[PDB]
Structure 1
Amino acid sequence: FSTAEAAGVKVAAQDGQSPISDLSVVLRGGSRYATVPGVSHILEKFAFQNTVPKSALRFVRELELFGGKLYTHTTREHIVLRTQFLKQDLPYFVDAFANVLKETKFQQFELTERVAPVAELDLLKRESDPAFTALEAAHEVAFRTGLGNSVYAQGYSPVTLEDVKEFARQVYAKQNVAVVGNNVVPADLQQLVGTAFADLQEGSKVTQAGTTTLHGGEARVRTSTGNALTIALPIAEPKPVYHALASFLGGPASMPWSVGASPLAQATVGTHTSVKATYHNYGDAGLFAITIKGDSPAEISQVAHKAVQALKDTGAEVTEEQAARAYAKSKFAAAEAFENPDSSASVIGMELLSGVSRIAPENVQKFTPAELSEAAAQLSASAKPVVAAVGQVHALPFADEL
């Protein structure tokens, strides 16, 4: 991805040999920057609504003629708007993004009838998985605000048209916008962005209201639709070793009809439960989480104990074999993330919008058994453990039990 600048907008493109191009606008407008709860989700859903030059209806009918597709999502850091089309149709897509950022008519009926109902279905689909809920709850406990804001719009706190219009006034500005073009000729994209995004406001960098503060605690989301448990450990100094530790501890199987050779995978033997360790770097803080879902609260409780033990055991000693297995699983995870268009866009988006240089999968550091065990030791000896239980919460573990 050759990083450049076109009319004040950071543009990164990588040419390829495929008939398919992906163009993504990455906006610094994720939920950590959200003025009011849920506004970044609503703004994401308000992309490709009526603009002054082109109605939502006309856009969709013309997109069907190009056979293009549209993908949008919100993270804690970004809003990502991606289009996938044939290479030759690049100018149309650039101009479409320009219309969205410059000329969206944010109309009250779109919010009531189109945008908010779709945002609500989006969230309900995600929450069907109790593990999603548990990991969301864990961020809320760990960070409270900023990273602790909900990503998604909720019913209890309604977003108004004035909320969304104000946020868009901040976000849709040259200072908060990065363009990422996969299989796009880099010189051609710079020329097009340079003409189309010239009259976009300059604006100012959106910032998190307040510094990131870490907290421990418990969340007990009582649902009737499945059971899950997250054990998170907030990290004050995000370090790349936690990727290796996440992949080492593992949890999912690398093979059909198997349990797996990872410590966390082996904690689920004899139970219909699954586990996944994940590490979330947010630049200024991190979260190391272990999420366990299952149908039995008794089995979840059983696995949860084994999971925290596994982490303690790792803090004791890692073998050389296990450290190499961690390097391999971690390099692979890095590679596939840079391939997947959704995650790819945000990776270069972070490089462009912040200044965090991307770590190429081929440059992923190999951590010795000493470095891995040291990282696990810090986590086992955390002052601020977070536990989010979802489901039959009376039957799930508590932080002080773990």
Structure 2
Amino acid sequence: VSPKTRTSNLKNGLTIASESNPLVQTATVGVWIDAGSRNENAYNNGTAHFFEHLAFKGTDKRSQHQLELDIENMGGHLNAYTSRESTVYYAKSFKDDVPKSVEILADILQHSKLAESAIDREREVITRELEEVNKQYEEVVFDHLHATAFMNQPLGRTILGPRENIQTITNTELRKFITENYTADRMVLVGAGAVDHDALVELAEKYFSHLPSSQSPVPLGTPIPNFVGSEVRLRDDTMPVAHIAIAVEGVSWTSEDYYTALVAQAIIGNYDRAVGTSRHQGSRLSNIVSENNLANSFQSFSTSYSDTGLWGIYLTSENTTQIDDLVHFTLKEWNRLSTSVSNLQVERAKSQLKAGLLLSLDGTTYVAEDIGRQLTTLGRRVTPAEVEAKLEAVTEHDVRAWAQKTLYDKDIALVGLGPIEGLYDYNRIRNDMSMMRW
């Protein structure tokens, strides 16, 4: 039984949330923000990611060099990432270096210079990032997947933004973005590891008290996406491995079917030929794929956003003449979530998930990430007892009913990259979303 997550607020509406672990000597403090690329329009798309670069380029007090030195002297590191719906800035340090790290984070968020000289310098760095993501195939596949599934909608945009915007982002629009979005009612100060809650609340009162509040404070994790069944093919015969993602519209964080979608995802599960145990996994798709050498790997996913999600699978394969079999067998396993699953698969997946949801949190950064994610998506940290009860509530009838309305005979978004000549056209893929025998 893990220690209780303590939660306090300031007057501006900044949440402070902490989970102490007296067995570790490091601490992760940081700021989770309920804001990301999805808050940009088409003209300033790329701003949030641009800011993340400039946040480390110097503040009104410390210059770029002083900032570098200050963190080096702390002993730990700082890290940041911007996603579609969430931005994070955190600092891992020693137990007693926590007040320094809170002070540095408060500085780079509130008091960053955003000097025209630095904007102009990063404008080239970010331009080079556009031509080097090209190598991270999983990311290429998932960014095309969002672009097509949410065609011409904010969730469909990339985080980097178009080349055109990178050349035209000004310090004005950067400042406007962080003034509109980085407000106290959208922010959570999180501490995990060797942190005292009462100490962290004091540090928040010292550094984050002059944060603007938004005019209309909605609750944390408050959002209309119209999924497009569609396909992107990026054939490249010179690549040896095909990367394929298939997804349907999934569930939001606060859906009533959130746990049902996780259980369904665990029934298919993951596979990787490089792991020794993977040939012995219980999943039917795992057995088909391993016995027939259809794939190097597959990874089921159920990605959630505030108002939508994507549920699907990501496959990698060198077997270029049997891509058709791989896709066929995968979608016939999805069909069985509608037609065939019983208490056998459901109770096995529940067993595996009851542990999996706890196992994931195995270090201070994972704990901080869990507190921050849950506070910015649900407005509260959900206790493991509540999670165990929501999983236990999932029956085989729930899984069948969910799959029948979410998967069965539904449109998919499909992305293929690499030697995908053997991937059939959209209709033949989408025809495997149902079974004529049922």
**TM-score, normalised relative to structure 2:** 0.82
Report the Cα offset of residue 349 of structure 1.
Answer: 2.9
Report the Cα offset of residue 375 of structure 1.
Answer: 2.4
Per the alignment, residue 200 of structure 1 pairs with 211
Per the alignment, residue 403 of structure 2 pairs with 376
Report the Cα offset of residue 346 of structure 1.
Answer: 4.6
In 2, Cα distance between equivalents of 1:400 and 1:273: 25
Report the Cα offset of residue 361 of structure 1.
Answer: 4.0
Change in CA separation of 1:383 and 1:373 when aligned onto 2, cut-off 3 Å: closer
Report the Cα offset of residue 252 of structure 1.
Answer: 2.3
Per the alignment, residue 59 of structure 1 pairs with 67
Per the alignment, residue 49 of structure 1 pairs with 57
Q: What are the superposed Cα offsets for residues 337-359 of structure 1, whole Å, 9 maximum, x if unpaired?
A: 44455554454334434544344
Q: What are the superposed Cα offsets for residues 28-80 of structure 1, whole Å, 9 maximum, x if unpaired?
A: 22122223322222222222221001122112112112211112112221111
In 2, Cα distance between equivalents of 1:222 and 1:370: 40
In 2, Cα distance between equivalents of 1:68 and 1:118: 26
Per the alignment, residue 426 of structure 2 pairs with 399
Change in CA separation of 1:301 and 1:360 when aligned onto 2, cut-off 3 Å: farther
Paired residues, number? 401
Select 1:271's aligned residue among 294, 312, 318: 294
Per the alignment, residue 256 of structure 1 pairs with 276
Report the Cα offset of residue 379 of structure 1.
Answer: 3.3
Per the alignment, residue 328 of structure 1 pairs with 351
Report percent identity of matched pairs. Answer: 19
**Contact 2:30/2:102 (CA < 8 Å) preserved in 1?**
no
**Contact 1:231/1:388 (CA < 8 Å) preserved in 2?**
yes
Select 1:241's aligned residue among 250, 260, 263: 260
Report the Cα offset of residue 266 of structure 1.
Answer: 2.4
Report the Cα offset of residue 89 of structure 1.
Answer: 1.0
Change in CA separation of 1:279 and 1:388 when aligned onto 2, cut-off 3 Å: same
Change in CA separation of 1:281 and 1:358 when aligned onto 2, cut-off 3 Å: farther
**Contact 1:246/1:279 (CA < 8 Å) preserved in 2?**
yes
Report the Cα offset of residue 236 of structure 1.
Answer: 6.2
Select 1:86's aligned residue among 73, 91, 94: 94
Per the alignment, residue 190 of structure 2 pairs with 180
Report the structure number with the largest CA radius of gyration.
2
In 1, Cα distance between equivalents of 2:90 and 2:70: 16
The more displaced of 323-332 and 84-93 is 323-332
Per the alignment, residue 19 of structure 2 pairs with 14
Change in CA separation of 1:83 and 1:398 when aligned onto 2, cut-off 3 Å: farther
**Structure 2: tracts of 5 or more residues without a match:** 430-438
Select 2:243's aligned residue among 218, 228, 241: 228
In 2, Cα distance between equivalents of 1:376 and 1:125: 38
Per the alignment, residue 189 of structure 1 pairs with 200
Change in CA separation of 1:125 and 1:346 when aligned onto 2, cut-off 3 Å: farther
Change in CA separation of 1:127 and 1:206 when aligned onto 2, cut-off 3 Å: farther
Per the alignment, residue 324 of structure 2 pairs with 301
In 1, Cα distance between equivalents of 2:191 and 2:123: 27
Q: Which amino acid aligns with 2:268?
A: L
Report the Cα offset of residue 305 of structure 1.
Answer: 1.1
Q: CA RMSD in A?
A: 2.8
Q: Which amino acid aligns with 1:166?
A: K
* 1:215 and 2:228 correspond: yes
Report the Cα offset of residue 23 of structure 1.
Answer: 0.6
The more displaced of 45-54 and 17-26 is 45-54
In 2, Cα distance between equivalents of 1:127 and 1:263: 33
Per the alignment, residue 9 of structure 2 pairs with 5
* 2:278 aligned counterpart, secondary structure: coil
**Structure 1: tracts of 5 or more residues without a match:** none
Per the alignment, residue 143 of structure 1 pairs with 150
Report the Cα offset of residue 330 of structure 1.
Answer: 1.9
In 1, Cα distance between equivalents of 2:361 and 2:409: 31
Report the Cα offset of residue 99 of structure 1.
Answer: 0.9
**TM-score, normalised relative to structure 1:** 0.89
Per the alignment, residue 73 of structure 1 pairs with 81
Change in CA separation of 1:165 and 1:227 when aligned onto 2, cut-off 3 Å: farther
Report the Cα offset of residue 120 of structure 1.
Answer: 4.5
Q: Which amino acid aligns with 2:25?
A: P
Change in CA separation of 1:73 and 1:113 when aligned onto 2, cut-off 3 Å: same
In 2, Cα distance between equivalents of 1:359 and 1:263: 32
In 2, Cα distance between equivalents of 1:301 and 1:292: 12
In 1, Cα distance between equivalents of 2:87 and 2:216: 15
* 1:132 and 2:155 correspond: no
**Contact 2:28/2:368 (CA < 8 Å) preserved in 1?**
no
Report the Cα offset of residue 127 of structure 1.
Answer: 4.3
* 1:261 aligned counterpart, secondary structure: coil
Per the alignment, residue 390 of structure 1 pairs with 417
* 2:266 aligned counterpart, secondary structure: helix
In 2, Cα distance between equivalents of 1:116 and 1:6: 40
**Contact 2:322/2:422 (CA < 8 Å) preserved in 1?**
no
**Contact 2:192/2:367 (CA < 8 Å) preserved in 1?**
no
* 1:29 aligned counterpart, secondary structure: coil
Q: What are the superposed Cα offsets for residues 303-322 of structure 1, whole Å, 9 maximum, x if unpaired?
A: 11110001112321224332
